[PDB]
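Example with several molecule types.
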Amino acid sequence: TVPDRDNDGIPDSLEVEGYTVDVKNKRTFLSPWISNIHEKKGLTKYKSSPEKWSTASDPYSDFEKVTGRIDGNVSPEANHPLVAAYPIVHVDMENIILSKNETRTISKNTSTSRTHTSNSNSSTVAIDHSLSTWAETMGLNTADTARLNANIRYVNTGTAPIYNVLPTTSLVLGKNQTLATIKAKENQLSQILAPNNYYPSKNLAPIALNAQDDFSSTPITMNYNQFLELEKTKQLRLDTDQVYGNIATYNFENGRVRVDTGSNWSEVLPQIQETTARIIFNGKDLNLVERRIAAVNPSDPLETTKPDMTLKEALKIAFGFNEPNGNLQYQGKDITEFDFNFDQQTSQNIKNQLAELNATNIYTVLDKIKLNAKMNILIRDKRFHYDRNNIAVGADESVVKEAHREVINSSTEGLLLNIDKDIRKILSGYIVEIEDTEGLKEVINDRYDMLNISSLRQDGKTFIDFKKYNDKLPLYISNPNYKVNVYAVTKENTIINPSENGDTSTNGIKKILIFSKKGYEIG
Amino acid sequence: TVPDRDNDGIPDSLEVEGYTVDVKNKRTFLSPWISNIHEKKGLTKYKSSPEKWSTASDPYSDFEKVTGRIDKNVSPEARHPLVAAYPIVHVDMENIILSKNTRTISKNTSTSRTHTSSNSNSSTVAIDHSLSTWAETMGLNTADTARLNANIRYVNTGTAPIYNVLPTTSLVLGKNQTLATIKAKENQLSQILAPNNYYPSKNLAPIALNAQDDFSSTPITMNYNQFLELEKTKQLRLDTDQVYGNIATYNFENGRVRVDTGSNWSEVLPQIQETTARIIFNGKDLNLVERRIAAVNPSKPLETTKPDMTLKEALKIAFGFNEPNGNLQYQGKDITEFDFNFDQQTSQNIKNQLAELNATNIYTVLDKIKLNAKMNILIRDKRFHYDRNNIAVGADESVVKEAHREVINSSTEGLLLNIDKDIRKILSGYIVEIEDTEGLKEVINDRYDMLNISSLRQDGKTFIDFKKYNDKLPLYISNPNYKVNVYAVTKENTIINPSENGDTSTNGIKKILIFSKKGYEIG
Amino acid sequence: NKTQEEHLKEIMKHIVKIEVKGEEAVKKEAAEKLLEKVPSDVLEMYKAIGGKIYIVDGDITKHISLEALSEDKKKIKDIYGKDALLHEHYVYAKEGYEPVLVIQSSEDYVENTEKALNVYYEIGKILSRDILSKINQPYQKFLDVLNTIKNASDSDGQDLLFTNQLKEHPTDFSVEFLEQNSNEVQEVFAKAFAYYIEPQHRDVLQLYAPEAFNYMDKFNEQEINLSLEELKDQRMLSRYEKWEKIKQHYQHWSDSLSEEGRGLLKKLQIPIEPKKDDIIHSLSQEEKELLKRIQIDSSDFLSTEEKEFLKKLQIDILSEKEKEFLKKLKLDIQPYDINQRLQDTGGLIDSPSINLDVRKQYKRDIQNIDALLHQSIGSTLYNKIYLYENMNINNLTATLGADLVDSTDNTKINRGIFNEFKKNFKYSISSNYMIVDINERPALDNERLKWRIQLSPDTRAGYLENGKLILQRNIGLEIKDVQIIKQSEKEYIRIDAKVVPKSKIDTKIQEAQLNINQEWNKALGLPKYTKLITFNVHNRYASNIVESAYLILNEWKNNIQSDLIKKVTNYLVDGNGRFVFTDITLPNIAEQYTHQDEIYEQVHSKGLYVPESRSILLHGPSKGVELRNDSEGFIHEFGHAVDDYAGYLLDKNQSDLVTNSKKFIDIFKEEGSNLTSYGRTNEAEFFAEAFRLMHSTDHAERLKVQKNAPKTFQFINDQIKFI
Ligand SMILES: [Ca+2]
Ligand SMILES: [Ca+2]
Ligand SMILES: [Ca+2]
Ligand SMILES: [Ca+2]
Ligand SMILES: [Zn+2]
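Resulting structure tokens for the full complex:
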């Protein structure tokens, strides 16, 4: 008959030469790739390995990926046989409330983000430092003890759902001062955590640490020095392990998809991490997304039998790049707008492949660069400046000034203007000052933490408020000849403490001039 | 009808007469060795034993090792049939605090894996002695009892992963005083500890003895005599046993690798340790790296059916030595720069095999020396001195001068130069004196615990700091006629305590100058 | 269930090897594993047209036989329509008078589908361009396949098998388009052969275009062996070696011949012509005086040749009692032909429709011929045997015998009449003696039907010296395929048949008889066991006579209201009626000589009503002098049946017909002179002609009887009032 080495349901010559699934009169048909038909329909040329039951070493087979007999929550770019399906869970903290262990309490709203430094995941919470001394409000001695409380949400960014189990999360202050350990209550909640969703999702109540219902869980407490350092840095750090529980699999006799107890995630993740090539990308809305594409490991005979994966085809099958008229690009955004950061060993390998091909521009030879397994590639955006965790905290002044070109409704109540959703992220505040014709400048919010004057409106734009720190009064324009400068600051320039000299004033803060208009009918 | 005695899956004539594994049109293909075809491609000639299911007696078969059907975490030099795959785990202690059951001492310890003159993996913790009396500083009388607290990380260096069970480590002070017993928290952590990785990894929090959230851990305490001995020795010792949990196996039906409950590491380690020859080596990064190579045992009739293993081929398959142009070398480093250490039985055996061959020099006869089982060989670098633990703890004066000889900066403020990462493991600090021509020497920081002026730099080139311990002020010579002498101190000469006379001076420190200049414009 | 070490054994069966043969032995065995899938017939034909199979190494433009190719021919498009170069590609085929197959050898032909697929594409391109273009193929059959592909609902076959030029062609495919674009048809046939051979793509070619799958499957089963033998027919030495083997095998029966056997064979060849003095001296009486004064060119019972023979007999020396002497002397001048007697009787050589000792001499000579034909064909000197025959269409039918060939050019076949021919020509019964050929000889001008008989292991035959063979009597033939060929620019008909015993064919005809009886008792409301339709069929065009009965009876049903049908068929069931739809001669179905008075008073025409036994005959091949089709013949005879039933509803003890009454003879002399010439002979034929034309398919022929004979219209519509 027809040889089938791996018993996955697809013969060998189809798996080395290209196969695709066609439907004619409502019946699934598995065909050899015949290119004069199958480009007109829009079907896709799959390739896989003849001697692996799953090519990317994930729990779903080759046949069950190409035909749709798979768990329905799996993301659509994980349907390809060469892209691995595995969950990636980090923890999203929304607000924190600090209190004294018996007003004297603090309630702030935090903004967390997922990090990647220079396999395990984590997240970094940046507590908002503006208005609404922490020891003065709380009334703490040296013999004090503090109580910490917050609201968290588990978020999935991977490509596979997690059934009934949540990970075990450690809470880290500074570098390695563990304040607490968060576990999932009752150990089995009958929930689901789909890819790109939350738990509990955005229209329910968040999980509270030590909630109003239960009491017997461990109270989270600090001493005085931990509270000093937390007032210094405004920054906690979550760390999450990788216990994800059992796997949902398919059954052929009735089409049911059920949680099979004889199959676990914690014994199949260290195969995906050993036989794939990881590409991280943040061109979507400046949040880091991680994918893994199966690639050829040359020194292993069952790993050289995978298909050959150029970097162009890896970007196409992973992130939805496409080339409309030759230039490979991502929803208009061309790839000359994107960097390439490598780690050490794959930088050595890419440099040897470029020296072999006698080319020096990597952006022109992407269809010839081969990927091997165990790589690490980071593709960032050129416009912004990134800190130690590959988070956009800075920009160049050109795009920051060009974000504020398009004006809508200017007055003396404030500014309402159309601003881009990518450039809102890097900006931390605004400074607003009044300049005479003679050369005196009077900043009207003379503190480091009265800069939160912009506010988003649910139609999709932001409205700057001038009244907000001027005793809810409109802008006093005595002589409308002289003007008011209102302009911005970036997160890499923002101060998060009083100074070592105690300076609360707005001096020393770097700044980008975005706005100066006359004061009459133009503004 | 095909002869197959060992049931591993490879016929007998292939295993005695040579075989190789080739991939051709994306399909695995095992075939006999035919030299005029297979020498050109760069394939490897494998041989094995026809009557053993695994030649090195580790739980991976010969077929599963050569073809890649294995747990992918197994190191690349253990895919050969003759190299044994098994974990080697010791404990890495980062930092210690001694508290009294501020007035608590905090130091940073630097531990290392030791091998004295097979069972268990011991490591020797060296406590830092520089500036932060210990009995005064903790305020301890005679009837005290101290408390110990530290942070550890389990670290694997073997060739095979450990699933879910960490070993049980004893903590020994001095020669044989047991302080405490470190056991695994929660009895299952659901982790993986691969080859060459740390648990917890380098970007999480270490495992703390007597942790903050745990309370049921027994306090690790001392009495007064043990505390004085710990202060006068600056040393601990960690003795780790060999309970390693179960083994991950390969399922031939659907490509799945899972932890097998009916197979165990505790029943296959005492066969690896009884049928194989051990070769310990430290040329890569000066750590003791243990490997085992399968070899004949002549008085056993199922052990003389292993392949004949020379010493050249043993080095080639275990450690990645190569001969590019006839000289066997290790990434440029030649093997006339390495010494051979033996124990007594294999020393007698090698002397008989040399007296047989009428040879006197071992380094020219390495392809003629045959290994047998239960040998023990230690290969060390010639340039360094070694202590009883076989840790690199010294060198001669010439190589230190000739390694520091390419100086970048030399003035009255410090000294910056490029220093190699092998020489940075044997130096405990630097001091600078001024020697008068009538014979008066002037040591500027005349204590045993102000040596740590050197700091690792982001450039990678360390700067010898003259400022920090001279009341933060540089050196002013009165006459450039008499000389300025700076000298490193090497770890076999570094003193860790005052003497019996309470001396803190510089006499007794045997000098190795890295600096010899008359003080003036030359340096 | 399978445990895990069994999976170790299966995966080591796929992986481990023991013997490695080097390179070149595996190179050689890969090429033969490539060519093993092709049928051996096209290899043998490529051997016979002068072709060389060159399995080479390296470059294929570096071989000697492809050296003189230009720069232009080194641009090759493969199976998918994409570009290639011959120093990059691996198989090329050289066109012309000395073809060459060049294949680069490698170990990639054993597992891959692409390279083997392109090799079978080049072999199919050789088959479409070289072998089949020597017998003028592909042709109208494959054009019907192409028009079925491009007139489908779904557009996947057009994408799979056609180029861009064949897509944008707005009309359908005519044979002009096969003339001036034959290379495109060759490409399409090659691509279909390529997808059919390579066994991975067979299900794909079945799914995307099923009609090409059916064509190629039936082709590679039968037509490839038939085309190899017809290609050997074009060569002379194959013909004469077949001649040699047949002469050596049939030698001893020609050695066991006597003089009487050779005389019987030669009298079976030609008819024994009558001599004229033996005719004239036979009379000598008043009978000579009746032969001497006679209207030669007036009586319509004898043919043209027969009236000319009587004109020849006047110089060797009237619709009244002299023409009975003409009826008696019709059978007296017909030649002693065994073939005409076997052709007219249909197996009953005891039918007393001719003279007495002539019947006995017929029967004894037929028994002598059948006793001499005893030798079987089963032998070991040969494989399958292909024996031919050129035959006239008029020997099967006279309805299609005139309009088969187109009137603009007489070397075409009219396709509408060809589809009417093809529709129901399923089998054949050979009662008479098929004088068949060993090899091909070109046909006479009236014979476009080109038979090709495949024999049985039990065929009984005898040998002739002049290049012919004769088959025995009562042989069954089941038709396989009827197609239009072209030979020397003259379009023909090729027909195959396969020899079966007679019991299977008569079993089929018995089943069809029982089915038509059940259906037409169910449609008329009659007793369960009544036999109202019967078939006495024994000739070559049997299947279409069996199938055409349904159209005949439905057209008779639709042209008359149901009440007259029910009443007159009830009368016929009471009077032992039949509707004999037969293709043998009218005096030999034994419903007609069991009531007539004289042998020479027998009738042979289109339809006939036997008045005593109330039966209606019909004749298969013969066409009426008046009629346009057979359905008007059945209405024409139902006219005489209505005449008889109206003759019974005047007095139940009196005359048989209503037209023999003198109350219709006046209307026959008044309005019996405005209609067609067939009914003008006497009153009954005008009666049947009026009843035929009043119920026509189109209403204008019904309106001609309205305008020409209105009182006869009112009288006939009064004759329906007898209910
Ligand atoms: Ca497969
Ligand atoms: Ca597969
Ligand atoms: Ca074996
Ligand atoms: Ca073996
Ligand atoms: Zn007539």
